[PDB]
Design a protein around this ligand. Structure first.
Ligand code: HEM
Ligand code: HEM
Ligand SMILES: Cc1cc(N)nc(CCCN2CCC(F)(F)CC2)c1
Ligand SMILES: Cc1cc(N)nc(CCCN2CCC(F)(F)CC2)c1
Ligand SMILES: C[C@H](O)[C@H](O)[C@H]1CNc2nc(N)[nH]c(=O)c2N1
Ligand SMILES: C[C@H](O)[C@H](O)[C@H]1CNc2nc(N)[nH]c(=O)c2N1
Ligand SMILES: [Zn+2]
Lengths: 412, 412
């Protein structure tokens, strides 16, 4: 009823009561745990009012006006609007609160110490794909802020019936293109080979190289999506160099500064925002480990090991491990030397522990997904490795949604 | 009902139906996942027969004689013995099967590809702490096999009433002593400071140094435990050197060859074996990462970084990561150069994937604990990082049990 999580490096115990407010389901049961499953598995008007009331009661509890006159009138005001319209509209203040607590509740995010410093851009007056492009461009410019990255979200109109959906078809606002070859291999980013081809289908002309920034595929109000090129002056990039190995520039690697997710769904008070691109700043490992060294991504451990002169015959020479660390010292160094905000996995995981402490103190808990919080290298030398974490689903939240090209009723 | 687990590096899917045979509870519910909780939380005669029948039905199913005459007679024979004695005794063949499947079912063990090659030593005729010492000595000698390590388990008499318990008080047969100081710090292994002091209480004379092998504290048939020194010729050790850095010998580190757990409980057909030391061989990271580099263990990242000439001022120089890899290349190299069996985390995790495949094919599943299977360094460059895993509890099994000094009714 009042569960306990322990840290096995400091012996610190914390008591979780926030999980009692949890509502959605995890996928786990009393007899099977699905904590390593990546994605465990129209809305009517009856279901909407409890979700609205639940959300309204915590918004007014947060401005220290729980159950007052202003609360009960907005309760009544939203009920009458759900009767009238079968849906409702958030105030600007409720949207900013909802968006900030979707991030706060994001159990897979190690960066949440920053959750209250989120800049929310209301794009609910948008009606066309061009309007979307303009809003997204202003998001990219604001969030980048000349390399002093600022976290932000842009929120396009909520879902209504279902066949009128705003969607960003890119999985991230800024991604590199992936082209397969006649000889079967892959240039660029293999993750986006499918999306890179959809752009070619709709008319993109590819500069078939490595780090080619993809165009935006924007869908407005259910209509077929349309292509727009982000002005290249708006795409900040960092060339990767090493502070010891001057052969590292010869590798000719670079990465974009802005991590900006655009394929998830924002849920606030039962309303569904199918297009809500949000952005922060990178933790180093996301680029240096997953992006650069996944076998099905850029997969550069091969070459970094070569140029270091390493024993690549035997698996147990740990040459993969040894090249992995050099690559991540270089991503960090390059970003910092250009004053482009980045955080190392040691500082980021310390901050999360400190954030976890604050949450248990002033909130009664912190939903956290250990499988996703522990970084993909040097896990046990970071403090989150030794921290027990309870995972549960609170709302407002960010959720996964199917890719648009599997679900969109086309019209030629 | 027939769940699916995916690998996100190869896109291989496998279907799990073994989880339906699962019985015990995980700690997770539909609303909270406890997959990162380390330890989530007398036996009467009524409860014993279903557990015996369940176990007997799968033993005879395994020798291809399910429900035959020999099965039903042993079913009857064990029922009558549970009526008569309120407990029962396993045949030698049932004990060897049970022990092997407790290992097979060990969801936190990455080494299970070896599960059917387990040497089982029946010590159920043991009655005294001296007898225990002799059995454990023969286990240590057999399992070490001059450095060609062999996996083995020794099984002392099962629990009966509860106040007559056989226990090994050491957490492992071979561990290094931990002494705190007058100046507050720690020499040796800080994990065992408590146990190292209990030995001093009962009469151990400490050679207060670093890698001092602890004595055995053995408890027979509920009696107060007694101290025995393993013959030092029986404790194989590997001095750690590096294949590049000749200053590495100056560190003066060494580790024992035999990982041999002695603090867990073996459950077979509802019988409880409170003393069942089992041993295998080390995966490199257990020593080089957890043993050597945990903040609350030996904690040598400090010195290895010094001797490498590293930028220790800034967290983001990844000097911890860089010294971590060198330490693990050295543990591997030292063990292999001495022909003492060890496995690197790359080979071990590949073998587990291949073991997982075999299990799903011929068994319908493989209970696996992702949080424990992914190694504590370079996680995402090993194949288990990208493998979804279902965790569930099958029997026979190894379980945790309280330390004996918290539960033992002493008599001066
Ligand atoms: C401020 C700097 C931030 C850092 C350092 C950070 C770091 C991370 C990392 C490393 C992950 C794991 C993702 C992966 O490994 O692919 C993650 C996940 C996530 N982040 Fe944060 N993030 C930041 C900002 C944000 C913001 C501003 C939001 C939302 C407004 C957000 C929402 C999420 C969500 C919902 C997830 C989990 C969903 C998913 O990616 O599958 N993050 N974050
Ligand atoms: C054959 C070589 C073996 C290897 C390479 C291996 C490897 C591992 C590793 C790395 C762990 C994680 C433990 C930790 O990180 O502290 C583990 C856990 C475990 N091993 Fe294996 N192991 C081996 C043999 C065995 C044997 C022979 C048994 C039993 C007869 C066994 C039973 C277990 C159990 C029950 C656990 C989880 C319980 C726990 O330690 O908390 N292992 N193993
Ligand atoms: C805002 C932000 C900051 C950051 N530092 N990193 C990320 C990465 C999120 C990765 N996540 C992968 C799965 C998905 F595609 F479904 C959604 C995106 C996002
Ligand atoms: C047989 C074996 C082989 C191996 N390579 N490694 C181990 C380590 C087990 C670690 N595990 C920690 C928690 C515990 F103490 F509760 C029980 C022991 C065991
Ligand atoms: C808090 C967390 O559960 C704890 O640190 C676990 C994580 N995973 C682990 N994995 C292994 N193999 N061994 C461990 O001791 C741990 N510790
Ligand atoms: C199979 C497993 O669930 C999958 O690889 C997960 C593991 N943990 C992760 N953790 C983070 N941060 N990002 C990821 O993509 C993943 N992938
Ligand atoms: Zn679970």
């Amino acid at each position: 009823r009042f569960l306990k999580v322990k840290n096995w490096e400091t012996d610190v115990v914390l008591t979780d009561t926030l999980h009692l407010k949890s509502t959605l389901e995890t996928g786990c049961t009393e007899h099977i745990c699905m904590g390593s499953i990546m994605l465990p598995s129209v809305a009517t008007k009856d279901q909407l009012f409890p979700l609205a009331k639940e959300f309204l009661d915590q918004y007014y509890s947060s401005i220290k006006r729980f159950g007052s006159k202003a609360h009960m009138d907005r309760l009544e005001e939203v009920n009458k609007e759900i009767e009238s319209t079968s849906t409702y509209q958030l105030k600007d203040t409720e949207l900013i609160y909802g968006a900030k607590h979707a991030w706060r509740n994001a159990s897979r995010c190690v960066g949440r110490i920053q959750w209250s410093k989120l800049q929310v851009f209301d794009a609910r007056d948008c009606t066309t794909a061009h309007g979307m492009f303009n809003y997204i461009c202003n998001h990219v410019k604001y969030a980048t802020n000349k390399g002093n990255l600022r976290s932000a979200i842009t929120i396009f109109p909520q879902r209504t019936d279902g066949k009128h959906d705003f969607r960003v078809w890119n999985s991230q606002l800024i991604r590199y293109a992936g082209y397969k070859q006649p000889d079967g291999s892959t240039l660029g980013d293999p993750a986006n080979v499918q999306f890179t081809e959809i752009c070619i289908q709709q008319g993109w002309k590819a500069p078939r190289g490595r780090f080619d920034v993809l165009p935006l595929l924007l869908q407005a109000n259910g209509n077929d999506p349309e292509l727009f090129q982000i002005p290249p002056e708006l795409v900040l990039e960092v060339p990767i160099r090493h502070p010891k190995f001057d052969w590292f520039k010869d590798l000719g690697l670079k990465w974009y500064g802005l991590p900006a997710v655009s394929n998830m769904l924002l849920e606030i008070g039962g309303l569904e925002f199918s297009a809500c691109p949000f952005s922060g700043w990178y933790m180093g490992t996301e680029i240096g480990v997953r992006d650069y060294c996944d076998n099905s991504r850029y997969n550069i451990l091969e070459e970094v090991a070569k140029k270091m002169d390493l024993d690549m015959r035997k698996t147990s020479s740990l040459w993969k491990d040894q090249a992995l660390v050099e690559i991540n010292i270089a991503v960090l160094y390059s970003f910092q030397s250009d004053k482009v905000t980045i955080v190392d996995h040691h500082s980021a995981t310390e901050s999360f522990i400190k954030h976890m402490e604050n949450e248990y103190r002033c909130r009664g808990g912190c939903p956290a997904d250990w499988v996703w919080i522990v970084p993909p290298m040097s896990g046990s030398i970071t403090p989150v490795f030794h921290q027990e974490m309870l995972n549960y689903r609170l709302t407002p939240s960010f959720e996964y949604q199917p890719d648009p090209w599997n679900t969109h009723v086309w019209k030629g």
